[PDB]
Amino acid sequence: LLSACTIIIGNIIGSGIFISPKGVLEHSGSVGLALFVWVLGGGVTALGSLCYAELGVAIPKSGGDYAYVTEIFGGLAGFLLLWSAVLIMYPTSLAVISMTFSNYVLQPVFPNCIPPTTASRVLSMACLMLLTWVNSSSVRWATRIQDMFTGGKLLALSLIIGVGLLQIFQGHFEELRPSNAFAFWMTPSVGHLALAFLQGSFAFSGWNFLNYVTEEMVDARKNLPRAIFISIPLVTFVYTFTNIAYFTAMSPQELLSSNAVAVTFGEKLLGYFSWVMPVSVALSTFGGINGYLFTYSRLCFSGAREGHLPSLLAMIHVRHCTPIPALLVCCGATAVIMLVGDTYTLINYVSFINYLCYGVTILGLLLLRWRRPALHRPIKVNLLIPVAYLVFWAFLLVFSFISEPMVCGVGVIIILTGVPIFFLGVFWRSKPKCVHRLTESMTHWGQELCFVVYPQ
Amino acid sequence: TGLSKEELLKVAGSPGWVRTRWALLLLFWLGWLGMLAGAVVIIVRAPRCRELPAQKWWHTGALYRIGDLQAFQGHGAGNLAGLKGRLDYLSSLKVKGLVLGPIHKNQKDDVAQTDLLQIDPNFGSKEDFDSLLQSAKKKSIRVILDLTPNYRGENSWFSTQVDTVATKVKDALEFWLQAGVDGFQVRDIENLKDASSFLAEWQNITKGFSEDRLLIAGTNSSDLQQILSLLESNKDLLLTSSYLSDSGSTGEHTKSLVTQYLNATGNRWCSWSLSQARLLTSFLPAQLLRLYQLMLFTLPGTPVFSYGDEIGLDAAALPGQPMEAPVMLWDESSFPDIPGAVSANMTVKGQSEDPGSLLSLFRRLSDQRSKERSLLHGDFHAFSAGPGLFSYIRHWDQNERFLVVLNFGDVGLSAGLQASDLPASASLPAKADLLLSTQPGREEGSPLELERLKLEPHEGLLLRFPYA
Ligand SMILES: *[C@@H]1O[C@H](CO)[C@@H](O)[C@H](O)[C@H]1NC(C)=O
Ligand SMILES: *[C@@H]1O[C@H](CO)[C@@H](O)[C@H](O)[C@H]1NC(C)=O
Ligand SMILES: *[C@@H]1O[C@H](CO)[C@@H](O)[C@H](O)[C@H]1NC(C)=O
Ligand SMILES: *[C@@H]1O[C@H](CO)[C@@H](O)[C@H](O)[C@H]1NC(C)=O
């Protein structure tokens, strides 16, 4: 139970608390509203995780949202979700993490003036290529470095919490007083709260990945809900304490005008020893990238296992047993998206599509409950939780389209474009000799280029 | 499905494909190494940040002189304890200081009786002053005392010998820095003989106690020579003088006055004010107040305003108010002597909820001066203007730039902005936003062209454009 709890905490926690605070503050307009947004997100993710756990214990099949949606709706929705996974959340998430790594590295060099875009983008791409090569090299090395990355991230968070506790003990709580905590510098419209929630929900991303590994624990039914109860509120409290430490370290404008919150925190509170901690945050970003690559490869394996994706994306190396074609494809995709925009827009985009997919799957769970009430479900949840999730999801989506329409519209366009390709790929089963010949030629070319074989 | 067998692939990839992988692996590794080298090369050859100047406390906002406490609150509340309730109002104005007083005991023209170490009981007791400091300190409103030896008499420094006066000032200083004041002000130094030596001594003592204590001097001279003759020995002295007292309603003349004064002193810190203990309205008409207030905040320096200036309060336009200490109008009942003689436009209460009121202009301007890096310590560059225009750029390193155009004339003109008078890093753009205008009828936040712009008579525009 405790080991599973640590698994949930490790999967949920990540380099999101190093990107969120500026975006949350810029929309909330006050410290108290930002903290309320944080705690509300920490509760809503708990609710969604509980409902997802109920869905996962209902269907012992593994594969996450992909498998669950393929089970309830069918092939079309499952392939649409897989398309959204391979195209949006994994590449945008990798690009965001790399960009924040570059920002955090270059901020001490240029403390006041923004670093050049070319250098930051080049550094991010170099880090990404290094990570892709490292993951392609081996697996035991990769997991060892991932474990030490997790150690570095937990060390950074522990030091931040300790410094915050030391500062609050000595009596620096000027901003936390209700006179200054609720000092609104701008009236927040409903869209501003929605965008702040979207920005702040990036830190919790990855809480779905426990369903991706549902087939590798013993007695999931007993430990899993208790695992959520112990883990997620602890994560919310940790994020709350980190935000409190940041706010005791700085002031609203003193924090918003910063490209990297943690490095300025170290340089203004820790003192001469500040140089150590940006390395820690960079190591945390390294770990996030490595974990995302692992989840990517596993997702591609699951996707090509069913057969909507071409079989070339699940083949392993003959010697090292690694799926290099998928890694190269994703590296290209994220390198493409990175040289387009900024961290803020990408975060909004990926969080919106995250919530859209979560709502789609939760609606699928509700449809399964309505259609099929007679199957044995080890755990049962009261309908208030799903109806609350549905109403919050609806309100959030309408607010997202109303306030900032471009990113949600383009995301909807890209996911909808996955329907005709699905119809021409899977629903169209009488492919002529030309299409089959091209497919097999590409298959053989991939085999001879990558030296990979189908897993046994 | 279709795929190549493991044994089949091993046979196929043996003869010549192995060389291809090694070449591709070496090529990809070489590209990564050069890619990292390029970033470091770009980083090394990148422009570096400019150091911050470590501003003191009298740099990030105006000062709010208070000539007389009796007229600031009115009858029945002329006490330091009553003033303690006003600090919420002052913090709304976001002033960074109050030139309070003077409050030392001085009956009439008596050097022996005049004691600068004892607070007159009429204004309150010492405990009230101490309580005032803590409330002000908690609200970050640094209190500056006034130490003019004679304020109830015709001569501010007595007709007798002044050596004993100097000792009294020094004794008052060491005592009052012990109390906890954050500066001092001496007015009417014209009547002080050889005042340069005393100012150097007092500034030496004031800076000796701490590096965050300032001395403010005030004289009524209006020419550049005696002002420089007083600032030749001392360089960290804020001097408020009637240098801009004459208006002339001519933008070119004001442009000359500001530019020459800065050029003569180099680029040292200055204080912009129209007098030492007088309001704006004593030298300007009603339509120019919204114009000067934009000029004083945007110029490089620490604006110094008298009490009742945010509302444009005037004593000559309302009978019963002495010109020296007009009574501040807090509400419709703030002047019970002549009921019905006051309006809602002349009181602070009636202007707090009006976006177009004079006080609203003060509050938004004071906000911009107190936070933006360009207005705080940015370089001030003034280029060629129109026949009666006055314009300048407030730029600082990579931060957002500011442009202000003032039309002191009464005839509508055009911008006529001329290039080749700014540094390469401060070149004007084709399009620039619009922050605020002195008069209603303009669209705020709308990017506006900088070549076909036209000026309404008696209008000042504040525009912002980021780095180009
Ligand atoms: C100012 O104080 C310093 C410190 O003792 C002293 O050396 C200097 O002579 C003083 N200057 C004047 C003009 O009193
Ligand atoms: C300035 O003060 C001097 C000294 O008495 C006086 O002669 C002169 O008239 C004053 N000027 C103004 C404009 O107050
Ligand atoms: C400042 O004055 C000097 C001496 O007259 C002159 O050479 C210089 O051009 C002036 N600078 C400005 C900016 O007016
Ligand atoms: C306020 O109204 C009075 C009464 O008509 C008028 O005299 C005064 O000029 C007005 N003030 C402003 C700023 O318009």
Author numbering:
A (entry chain B): 42 to 497
B (entry chain A): 163 to 630
Paper text:
Apart from the conserved disulfide bond, Asn153 and Gln294 of Asc-1 could form hydrogen bonds with Arg535 and Lys533 of 4F2hc, respectively, in the apo state (inward open Fig. 2b). When aligning the D-Ser bound structure with the apo state in Asc-1, only a slight movement of TM1a towards the interior is observed. However, upon further comparison between the D-Ser and L-Ala bound structures, or apo and L-Ala bound structures, significant movements are evident in TM1, TM6, and TM8.
The Alanine-Serine-Cysteine transporter 1 (Asc-1 or SLC7A10) forms a crucial heterodimeric transporter complex with 4F2hc (SLC3A2) through a covalent disulfide bridge. This complex enables the sodium-independent transport of small neutral amino acids, including L-Alanine (L-Ala), Glycine (Gly), and D-Serine (D-Ser), within the central nervous system (CNS). Here, we present cryo-electron microscopy (cryo-EM) structures of the human Asc-1-4F2hc complex in its apo state, D-Ser bound state, and L-Ala bound state, resolved at 3.6 Å, 3.5 Å, and 3.4 Å, respectively. The HAT-specific disulfide bond is found between Cys154 of Asc-1 and Cys211 of 4F2hc.
